[PDB]
């Protein structure tokens, strides 16, 4: 069963690089046990992934990928895994562990840029995978892919990318009940490398007259 689980991890391929956002919450049933669980990591030189779902399993996937990437690096023969190979390895491991009826309970968003070809893709807890311009997991797949599809552009700027991604993440924060206001945006680019935003919280709006007074009256509401 999933015990300590996280939530949506949206993804948006923008000009000159890739952006991924994910709140810092790990919930335990209904409680938010944890509110500072960095759920985005940088993998190798050319990659970056976030995970949703069980946080123990995600921490294990990090060990798998760290051994993979260290073994890859120690060769020093001048070729390394780009986003594509890393994502394919992730799909293979997730599917294999599904075949054992012992799944890794996570949903993985992995993306990155290598040789000027920027890749972004996803993997499910049962091996379902696809590579796209913008991906999401969990409720980010209901409440964020509509707005991502609606507003994504071929050459989205970095600031426009951040503002779109925050639009999505705020829309989730309004209506997910599993999401904490803390969150991180991760930037990966060619020749800059991965760069993870410091944690922060988004301003939210509640002062609508209909909210203040459901119905309307001097006494009732």
């Amino acid at each position: 069963y999933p015990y300590v689980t996280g939530t949506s991890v949206i993804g948006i391929k923008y000009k000159d690089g890739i952006l991924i956002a994910a709140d810092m919450g790990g919930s335990y049933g209904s409680t938010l046990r944890y509110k500072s669980v960095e759920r985005l990591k940088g993998i190798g030189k050319h990659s970056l992934l976030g995970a949703s779902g069980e946080i123990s399993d995600f921490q294990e996937l990090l060990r798998y990928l760290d051994d993979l990437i260290l073994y890859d690096n120690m060769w020093d023969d001048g070729n390394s895994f780009g986003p594509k190979e890393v994502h394919n390895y992730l799909t293979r491991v997730m599917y294999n562990r599904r075949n054992k009826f012992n799944p890794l309970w996570n949903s993985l968003v992995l993306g990155g840029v290598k040789n000027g070809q920027k890749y972004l893709g996803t993997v499910n807890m049962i091996g379902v995978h696809y590579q796209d311009n913008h991906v999401a997991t969990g409720f980010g797949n209901h409440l964020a892919v509509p707005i991502l599809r609606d507003e994504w552009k071929e050459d989205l700027s970095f600031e426009d990318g951040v503002r779109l991604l925050e639009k999505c993440m705020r829309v989730l924060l309004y209506r997910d009940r599993s999401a904490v206001n803390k969150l991180q945006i991760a930037k990966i680019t060619e020749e800059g490398g991965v760069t993870i935003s410091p944690p922060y919280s988004l301003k939210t709006y509640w002062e609508f007259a209909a909210f203040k007074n459901p119905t309307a009256g001097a006494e009732g509401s």
Binding site: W75, N79, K84, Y89, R92
Partner: protein
Amino acid sequence: NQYDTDVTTWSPAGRLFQVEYAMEAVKQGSAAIGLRSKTHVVLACVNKAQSELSSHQRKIFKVDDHIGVAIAGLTADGRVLSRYMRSECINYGFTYESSLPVGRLVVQLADKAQVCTQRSWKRPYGVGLLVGGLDESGAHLYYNCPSGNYFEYQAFAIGSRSQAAKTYLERKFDTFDGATRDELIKHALFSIKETLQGEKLTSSVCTISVVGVGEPFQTLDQQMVQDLINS
């Protein structure tokens, strides 16, 4: 010689006579040539016409779209190793969906030969390979040896009567660096001509194969090779 008869027994001089002999197997086999450029690797083989009745056997094996082999020595061990490399490249493709670099495949192959070289009750493979394929850094030529050592070369000739080919390549390897595909093929034909004791230039005796940065591994046909020698 008391230390001669087993793989695990170091002689007082520090020599594994069994591995030395396994390396004698390749020096006795039919000759193979190999030579490269920044982007292309040519694998040939002076495959003998022993009799008017017999034919030869396939020595230059494809392994992947981008890696080729040219065994030398016990053909059965060569077949086993080529099968192994083929399956290894296919596994790499299955997992990462990309080409396995040559530099890594050769090291894995050398580890296989070594682990055979170490344990008792086993024997060194007794076949030496000229492996050449592709990598992000271009195209490479390697020589696996039965002893578990491996090397990277600009051009190398192994098998019987290779000195005739080596003494030629020594005087031309320095131009291969940027030479165009056809220049490598012409050089390889000349090399095969040198090792050809009969000195007869015919398409039947020698086989050629080429792999390049955008040229999947392929074996030049009898007619095409005959056309080149006719030149």
